[PDB]
């Protein structure tokens, strides 16, 4: 990347970091600047004569590279940079710490014909790798790797028990179970970070979809009470005490 004719881009990508970071935090204003900045550079990488000479992966391999480096340096400025968000991370974690100890497939409507041995342990560990990456792309992959893992074992169960391939009647509930069991810390923040800073043009199709899934997984898990997981208002609360005591 550090070719003796790249200096133009560096002086720009460096100068945006300073200009940008030296702004007081605003989630709307900030990310509109970043998604705004990415275009400026998008055209730029492709226009730049010294780069003749490229396919389409190569145009993205560049954009990913810019999404990454830039977001790395700007991470602690964009990620959970306000208080109301940090609280939502705390609130969720508490909820998920407790409910994981006693939730079962039925609560969320997962039929036995789709129940898994491991509790889809492999899916859980993919989400749990989320804070091991700083690039919006990489973070997203953690999520998509969770989704795929889920589908394979789900698809398997359909073959195993002769049914059709699985739809949202199967995926959404298992995603939740698996999110609760997983407790991927700083979720609320995480899902927004990716939402605000994944090169907008890539947050689309197959990806946008399963992202809306996990976003609605957060929502649901946030709102959990007896009724949303189908339990007596007695059982549910008692379980909460137990879980609290453990």
């Amino acid at each position: 990347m550090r070719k003796p004719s790249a200096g133009d881009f560096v002086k720009s990508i460096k100068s945006f970091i300073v200009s940008f970071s030296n702004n007081a935090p605003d989630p709307e204003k900030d990310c509109a600047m970043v998604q705004e900045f990415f275009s400026k550079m998008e055209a730029a990488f492709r226009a730049h004569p010294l780069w003749s000479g490229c396919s389409e992966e190569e145009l993205d391999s560049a954009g990913d590279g810019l999404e990454k480096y830039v977001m790395t340096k700007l991470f602690t400025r964009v990620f959970a940079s306000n208080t109301e968000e940090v609280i939502a991370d705390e609130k969720l974690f508490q909820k998920m710490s407790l409910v994981q100890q006693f939730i079962s497939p039925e609560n969320l409507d997962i039929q036995p014909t789709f129940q898994n041995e491991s509790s889809w342990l492999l899916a859980q560990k993919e989400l749990q790798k989320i804070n091991m990456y700083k690039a919006p792309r990489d973070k997203l992959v953690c999520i998509l790797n969770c989704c795929k893992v889920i589908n394979n074992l789900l698809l398997n169960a359909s073959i195993a028990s002769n049914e059709n391939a699985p739809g949202a009647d199967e995926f959404l509930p298992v995603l939740i179970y698996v999110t609760i069991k997983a407790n991927p810390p700083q979720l609320h923040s995480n899902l927004l970070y990716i939402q605000r800073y994944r090169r907008e043009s890539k947050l689309v199709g197959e990806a946008a979809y399963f992202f809306t899934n996990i976003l609605s997984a957060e929502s649901f898990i946030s709102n959990i009470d007896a009724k949303s997981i189908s339990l007596d208002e007695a059982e549910f609360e008692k379980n909460m005490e137990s879980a609290r005591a453990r």
């Binding site: 391939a165 699985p166 949202a168 009647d169 509930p173 197959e206 609605s216 929502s219 649901f220």
Partner: protein, 152 residues
């Protein structure tokens, strides 16, 4: 030409996912071309279980279209289909091409909902009805085009 977002709505046992399988997972792309205009279809599956009803709007946010499936052999899902279109009529952007599909007609005498019952309600509310079937490939290829024809 036109990227387009479609949403399936309806309960379990409406079999919307058994339905779209003939149209070739929870999500399906399909670039479809009609009358020199070309439409890419982004089709989005939803969880049909009541306990998720209020997640629905996170999915149909920015929907170009929606298909509402019900079960013809089990009456109560037709009513759930009513509440759906009712909810769409109100919460989606008013420029939305909706379609009603009555699935599982693949049973030659079990059907509990009449063709008029369905045709009349659909007519009344600005959409068409189709008698969908997954076992006999009926009205799957078909239903997407009529919607395509109708997109801004």
């Amino acid at each position: 030409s036109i990227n387009a977002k479609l949403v399936l709505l309806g309960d379990v046992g409406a079999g919307k996912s058994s339905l779209v399988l003939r149209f070739v997972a929870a999500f399906f792309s399909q670039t479809l071309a009609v009358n020199d205009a070309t439409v890419k279809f982004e089709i989005w599956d939803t969880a049909g279980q009541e306990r998720y009803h209020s997640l629905a709007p996170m999915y149909y946010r920015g929907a170009a279209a929606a298909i509402i499936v019900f079960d013809v052999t089990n009456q109560a899902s037709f009513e759930r289909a009513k509440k759906w279109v009712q909810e769409l009529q109100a919460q989606g952007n008013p420029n939305m091409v909706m379609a009603l599909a009555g699935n599982k007609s693949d049973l030659l005498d079990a059907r509990k909902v009449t063709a008029e019952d369905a045709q009349t309600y659909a007519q009344e509310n600005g959409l068409f009805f189709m008698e969908t079937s997954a076992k006999t490939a009926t009205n799957v290829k078909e239903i997407f085009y009529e919607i395509a024809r109708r997109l801004p």
